[PDB]
C-alpha cells in the first residue's frame, strides 16, 4: 500500500534547475490560504471547487478554486461545511482570484476538545544525520499533508535557508509522511530540472487532498548538502 521510499534517481537536484528558486520560496515562504466553516459555491471543471474565500492580508483575491485529483473527490465535498489549507499560485491560475489543490477537510467533528493544538515532530536530516527536530502544531484531528508540509518547509526556510532567492544550499530534498498503520508517501522538495519552475505543476501532488491523523503521524525531511 506503501510508497517505495527514493531512489537515488527519483529525486530532482537543485545543480540542474536552472531557474529562480525564490519561484519554489514563494509557495513556503508564509504563503497559504486558510479559510473556516466555508461551503463551495462555484465549480470550473469536473475535479475543482471554488469558494468565497479572502485573504485578509495583502488582498489579493476573494475566490480560491481548488482542483482536485478527480470527479468523485469534487462531489463529495460540493455541499459539505469544510475548512480549507493550501499553498495558492496565480500563474495560468485561470477560471480578486487565486488557484490552489486539495487542501480540504469537513470541518464537523474534527477537531480537538479543549480546543487544543495538536504538535506534529518534524525531524530534519541532513546528509543522513539528525540535526535538528521540531514541532508545527493543528488543530485538526484529521489534517492535510498538505498543511503540516507548508508549515514544515516555512520554517525551514526561516532556519535553514532551505530555498532561497537564487538557489538552495541542499541538492536533494524529501518529506516523508509515516502513518500509524505504517502506510508512507513523500512529496519532493525541489524543482523539476530546467530553467522554469512551474507552479501549478509542482503543487498539483497535492491533488489528492491526502489526509493524516494528526496525533499519531510522523514527518521526516531528509536533505542532502550542494
Ligand atoms: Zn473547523
Not at 22 to 37: C, E, F, I, Q, R
Not at 66 to 89: F, H, I, P, R
Not at 169 to 194: R, S, V
Request: glycine letters at 4%; hydrophobic letters at 30%.
Amino acid at each position: 500500500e506503501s510508497q517505495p521510499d527514493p531512489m537515488p534517481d527519483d529525486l530532482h537536484k537543485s545543480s540542474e534547475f536552472t531557474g529562480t528558486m525564490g519561484n519554489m520560496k514563494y509557495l513556503y515562504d508564509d504563503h497559504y490560504v486558510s479559510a473556516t466553516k466555508v461551503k463551495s459555491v462555484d465549480k470550473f471543471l469536473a475535479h475543482d471547487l471554488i469558494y468565497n474565500i479572502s485573504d485578509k492580508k495583502l488582498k489579493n483575491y476573494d475566490k480560491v478554486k481548488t482542483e482536485l485529483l478527480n470527479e468523485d473527490l469534487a462531489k463529495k465535498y460540493k455541499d459539505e461545511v469544510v475548512d480549507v489549507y493550501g499553498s495558492n499560485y496565480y500563474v495560468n491560475c485561470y477560471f480578486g482570484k487565486t488557484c490552489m489543490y486539495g487542501g480540504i477537510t469537513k470541518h464537523e467533528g474534527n477537531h480537538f476538545d479543549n480546543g487544543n493544538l495538536q504538535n506534529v515532530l518534524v525531524r530534519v536530516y541532513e546528509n543522513k544525520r539528525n540535526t535538528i527536530s521540531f514541532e508545527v502544531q493543528t488543530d485538526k484531528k484529521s489534517v492535510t499533508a498538505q498543511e503540516l508540509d507548508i508549515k514544515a518547509r516555512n520554517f525551514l526556510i526561516n532556519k535553514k535557508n532551505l530555498y532561497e532567492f537564487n538557489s538552495s544550499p541542499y541538492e536533494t530534498g524529501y518529506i516523508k509522511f509515516i502513518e500509524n498503520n505504517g502506510n508512507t508517501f513523500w512529496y519532493d522538495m525541489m524543482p523539476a530540472p530546467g530553467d522554469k519552475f512551474d507552479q501549478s505543476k509542482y503543487l498539483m501532488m497535492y491533488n489528492d487532498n491526502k489526509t493524516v491523523d494528526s496525533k499519531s503521524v510522523k514527518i521526516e525531511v531528509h536533505l542532502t548538502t550542494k
